[PDB]
């Protein structure tokens, strides 16, 4: 019960690098701000897809927040 909720955002453009910033930082901003687990998967070819997983609404909030703001 409770487990951990996850979701993948269909990304493509240079979102990862932009998000991770220098060497990955934003991933922590949300992971802490939204108490979620946002991770940027490297090595891409055709399409991109970030992995987001948390528990409370935070995971779904940060998820949609990225797909929209993608800050």
Curated annotation (Swiss-Prot):
**Entry function:** Appears to play a role in cell sterol metabolism. It may function to protect cells from over-accumulation of cholesterol.
Top-level taxon of origin: Eukaryota
Instruction: Spell out the disulfide connections.
Output: none
Shown stretch of the complete protein: 432 to 502 of 1268
Domain annotation KH: ranges: 12-71
Q: Which residues carry this modification: Phosphotyrosine?
A: 6
Where is the protein localized? Cytoplasm; Nucleus
Protein name according to UniProt? Vigilin
Encoding gene per record: HDLBP
């Amino acid at each position: 019960i409770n487990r951990m909720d996850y979701v993948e955002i269909n990304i493509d453009h240079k979102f990862h690098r932009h998000l991770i910033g220098k060497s990955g930082a934003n991933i922590n901003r949300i992971k802490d701000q939204y108490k979620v687990s946002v991770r940027i998967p490297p090595d891409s070819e055709k399409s991109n897809l970030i992995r987001i997983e948390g528990d409370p609404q935070g995971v779904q909030q940060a998820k949609r927040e990225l797909l929209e703001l993608a800050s």
